[model samples]
Target: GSHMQFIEGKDYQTVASAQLSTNKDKTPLITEFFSYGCPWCYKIDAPLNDWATRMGKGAHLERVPVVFKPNWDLYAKAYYTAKTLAMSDKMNPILFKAIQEDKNPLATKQSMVDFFVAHGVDREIAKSAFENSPTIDMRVNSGMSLMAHYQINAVPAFVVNNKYKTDLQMAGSEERLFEILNYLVRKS
Candidate 1:
């Protein structure tokens, strides 16, 4: 009953190859490209979580840590390791606050393994997987290619259905960002 009328180009741009959805139900896949090292990313966590929770079955949102700068590669490794250990859902937000809000040593890849231990994972397993897991490496490489494919230059950006791309800045606000996401989800 309420559509905000967001303009294309201003609010969001269409993904180049735009893997337009094909399913009958059309559950859009929204990929959020982010990094733990980003202050804005830490800030967006709460609002984004709220929107994702509210969306329920309307769409599927997946977070991919981007290796966009020096030191960022480690966070992506940690993320993939967490994925391997089935801890990402629990650790993603916690690690963000620890590194950005608490200013912890967890920000360092070398020190990051300890954070995993504190969270109930074995220290050695986490240490090894963080740096050596084949699956983790594969995920990292795939994420890098995906980031390039989407031409995402900044953190806290959203790409809906691998086709439409937007960020908080482009959307004007978090509220407006979700509006554009919904618009894109239903577009195809």
Candidate 2:
């Protein structure tokens, strides 16, 4: 039998706005690593987002979208591109809403660009970010490495403080997941 481990607090650094919060004494980060096509992930989205908000300035709630396969690869690419371009906070939910709620694929570069433009990102900025943006390659590789690092075999995973990572099935319920998150944050 195997168990998850806690990543040391000192190793975690702020990379994206997702890492904006710091518990200082309590350093565990609550991160949701999900894919666009996962229904269960959607079910937990609202509650988790709200919980993240309520956690306020002490705890961090981060979202990392993974490319586990070809189908998810598209969304993964768009996610990192938007993040690199600093448009993720603005467009992630919109894109998620379009895919999960509006029933759209957004599986191509052109389609992602269209979505970004529709959301009011400057056409030129969106175009470059979608096309040959320098960050694209870096993030794609980063996504790949993350998949390996966490040993993810499914969507809707959580890494608490980068110290422990768990799949939804293991957590049992969304409520249980957050319970674990709060515990970790307190310990960190």
Candidate 3:
């Protein structure tokens, strides 16, 4: 696992972590480490989304998805494909609801493609991209690299500019989770 670096300021750069861009005098970076199939991640998605927008200029939020091994490959592939298509942020809630509420298995290629097409993305575009496209491959590679860097064996973890990394579930509440994040943001 990589060592965490704490920036001794409220406003720090995002480049402290490899997953985000560098930003000085900018919003605090909130890095969410999650998987689409994880119910706990889905449960927290609402608050995260709400805070991402509400926090606005105060924080920069980035979702760093983790795709483990064979069992989670489908979720990983779908996540990368969405990112490749510039649809990850756009399709976040959709994919979450599809699995968590709608009970859809968007983990597979065909199923994920269908989900994309059914939700306004051009079928041809999604099909071509998900089927061995360059962007998709790059995103997948980046995700794998981060996974290796963090030695992350599971999902639903969060990192604040590499200053604080945790699964947060140990806290037993989202409020406490954000409380921990607030404390971490200060160190950044």
Candidate 4:
């Protein structure tokens, strides 16, 4: 409803900025707390990417993969490595399918790197992204830290500008969730 009103703590919740990272570009950082192991994260991928494409630089959309489980830990590194190679958008669906559907268990660094290599990444390049002296680990570790900082307890949660956090449950539906996301960005 275009006439719908969004109320804080209902459509979204407050994320106090006692200690959060700032974007030097001055754009709002819309962080999605997610994981490849999560089916819901896979479900939201398309629409979220669409929204991200249309977001018009008014904000920046960033994804933080959760690694609460040992298995997800590997997936987290995979995501960061993919991002480093600028192949995340291309491999996200593949990664999801491999994990959630194909059951291609990527339990080790070699398997993850091989997955990328199979997807057209050179062995050396993939290795750098995965082992460039903490490049991948740095991003993944920040994700881990941010998840703890925001107290993210579930996947597919959206946090905008480190001030407003939301999800499908709170918004009641995926469609309305995007609406709340837009409203929150506009609230910026």
Best by TM-score: 4
TM-score of each: 0.87, 0.77, 0.77, 0.88
lDDT of each: 0.79, 0.67, 0.68, 0.82
Selected candidate, larger lDDT, 1 vs 2: 1
lDDT of 2 by residue, 28-47 (tens): 56666777667777778778
lDDT of 3: 0.68
Give the RMSD in angstroms, all C-alphas superposed, for model 1.
3.1
Question: Between prediction 1 and prediction 4, which has the larger TM-score?
Answer: 4
Candidate 2 residue-pair clash tally: 5
TM accuracy, model 3: 0.77
Model 4 / residue 85 / CA error / Å: 1.2
- By lDDT, rank the candidates, best first: 4, 1, 3, 2
State how far residue 142 of model 2 sits from its true place (Å): 1.1
Task: Locate the minimum summed-lDDT window of 10 residues in model 1.
Answer: 18-27
Candidate 2 residue 69 C-alpha distance from true site, Å: 3.3
